DNA sequence: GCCAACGTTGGC
DNA sequence: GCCAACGTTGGC
């Protein structure tokens, strides 16, 4: 993607519920594996 | 207070 | 209706 070396991104499927088969991505630092739950919120963390 | 799980919201 | 960013919240 945009994301800069050793970003890993996750899918995790919603397994119950209303929105269950819906996928959520999360991003991990490559260092020291912090996650984000967006892409706005890593392009932040990033951008400052 | 952290956060995983699932809900809500509005631009497309 | 989809998408995905973000709201909420109860169990730890």
């Known amino acids: 993607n945009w994301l800069p070396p050793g970003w890993r991104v996750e899918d995790k499927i919603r397994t119950s519920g209303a929105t269950a088969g819906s996928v959520d991505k999360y991003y991990y630092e490559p260092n020291t594996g912090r996650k984000f739950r967006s892409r706005t919120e890593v392009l932040y ?4």
Do not use: A, K, R, V
């Open 45 to 48: 963390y990033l951008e400052h």
